[model samples]
Target: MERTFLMIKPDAVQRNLIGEVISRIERKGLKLVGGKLMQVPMELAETHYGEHQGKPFYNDLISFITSAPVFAMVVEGEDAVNVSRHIIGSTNPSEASPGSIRGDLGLTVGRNIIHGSDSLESAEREINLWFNENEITSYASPRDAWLYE
Candidate 1:
C-alpha cells in the first residue's frame, strides 16, 4: 500500500471541519493510519516547508500555517499520494474543481484549506516529520480485501 501525508490547515479546523474532512477521506475508503490535532512550532513549520524557503511566498506560507492548529494525518492506500491530492484539489481555489476539498471550502492559494504530499518522496518526509514510529498504528480492516485485489 502507498501512504501519503495530509494536513487540514488551521482555517479548516477553526471552521469546525475536522469531522467533515475526515468523513470525506474515510468515505473515499482510504485507511487512516494516523492523525492528530496539533499546534505547529515555528521550527517545525520552517522545516516542513523548507523546500519553499527561498520562494517569494515562503514567509507568508510559514506565517499562515503556524498561525493556528492543523490536523495532520498519514493515510495509506493504493495510489495514496495522487488520490489524496485529487481530493484536496488545486492549490489555487479558483481553479479547483467542485467536489474537491479546496473547491468547496477554500478561497485562496494561501488559505487552500488542506495540504497533501505532492509525491512519494514528500510523503515519506512528511510522515516522518509529523508522526513518530510509535505514533502510527498497523492493523487491517476487513473491508480492505474488497477494496483491493
Candidate 2:
C-alpha cells in the first residue's frame, strides 16, 4: 500500500472539523495507519516547510502551524498521495471544487484547513518526521478485500 501524510491544520482543529475530514478520508477507502494530535515545535515546523525556505510567507507559515494543535495522520492505500490530494482540494479554497474539503469548509488560501503531501517522497519524509516507527501500526482491514482486487 502507498502511504501519505495528511494533516488537519490548526484552523480545522480549532473549528472542530476533525471528524468531518476523517469521515471523508475513510469513506474514500483510505486506511488510517497512524494518527495523533500534536502541538508543533518551531524546529519541526521549519524543517517540514524547509523547501519554502527564504521565501515570503515562510515565517508566517511556520508561525501558524506551530500556533495550535494539529491532527497528523499517516494514511495508506493505492496511490495514497494523489488520493489524499484530491480529497484535500485546491490550496486556494476559492478555486477548489464543490464537495472537496477546502471548497466546502474554507474561505481563503491562508487558512485552507488541511495539508496533504504533494508527492511520495515528501510523504515519506513527513510521516517519518511526525511519527516514530512504533507510532505507526500495520494491520489488515476487514474490508480490504472488497475495496481492492
Candidate 3:
C-alpha cells in the first residue's frame, strides 16, 4: 500500500467541509491512517511551505494557513498520491474539473480547499512532517478485500 499526505485547508474547515472531504476519501477507497485538527504554528507553516519561500504568494499563503485550524491527514492506498491529487482537483479552482473537491468546493487559487502531496517522495516527507510515527495507525479494513482484486 502507498501513503500520502492530504490536508483540509483552513478555508475548507471554516466552511464546514471536513466531513465532506473525508467522506470522499473514504468512498474512493483510501484508508485514512492518521488525522488531526489543530492550529498551525509559524515555524511549521514556514517549513511546510519552504519550497515556496521565494514565491510571490509565500507570505500570504503562510498567513492564511496559520490563520485558523486545519485538518491534517495521512491516507494510505495504492497510488495514493496521484489518486488523492486527482480527487483534490487543480490548484486553481477555475481550472479544476467539476467532480473534484476543488472544483466543487473551492473558490479561487488562494483558497483551493485542500492540499495533497504531489508524489511518493513528497508524500513520505510530508507524512513524516505532519504526523508522528505513533500517531499513524496500521490496521486492516474489512472492505479492503472487496476493493482490491
Candidate 4:
C-alpha cells in the first residue's frame, strides 16, 4: 500500500465542502489514517509551498491559504498518489475533466479546492510536514486483504 497527503484547501473549507470532500475520499475506498482541521500559519504555508516560491502567484497563494482553516489528511491505498491526483483533477479548472473534483468545484487554478501530493517524494515530504511519527496509526480493515497483493 502507498500513502499520500491530501488537503482540503481554504477555499473548500470556506465553501462548507468539508463533508463533501471527505465523502469523495471515503467513496473511493481509501483508508484515512489521520486528519485535522487547522488554521495554517504563514511560515508553514510558505514552507509547504516552497517550490513555488518566487513565482508570480506565490504571495497570493500564501495569503489565500492562510486566510482560513483547512482540512489536512493522510490517506492510504494502492497507488495513492496517482489516485488522489486523478480525483483532484488538473490545477487549471479550465482544463479539468467534468467528473473530477476540481472540475466540479474549482473556478480557477488559483482557487482549486484541494491539494494532493503529486508524487511519491512529495507524499513523503508532505506527510512529514503535517504529521509527526506518533500522529499516524495502524489498524487492519477486513477489506485490506482483497485490496493488496
RMSD of each: 0.9, 0.7, 0.6, 1.1
Candidate 3 overall lDDT versus native: 0.94
TM-score list, all predictions: 0.96, 0.98, 0.98, 0.95
Cα lDDT listed for each candidate: 0.92, 0.94, 0.94, 0.91
lDDT of 4 by residue, 91-135 (tens): 998798888889888899999999999999999999999999788
lDDT of candidate 2 over 31-62, digit per residue (tens): 99999999999989999999999988788899
Where's the lowest-lDDT run of ten residues in candidate 2? 54-63
RMSD of 1: 0.9
lDDT of 1 by residue, 1-149 (tens): 79999999998998899888898888888999998999999989999999999999999999889888999999999999999888889999889999999999889898888899999999999999999989898889999998988
lDDT of 1: 0.92
TM-score of candidate 4 relative to the true fold = 0.95
Show pairs that collide, candidate 3. none
Model 1 ranges with Cα > 4 A deviation: none
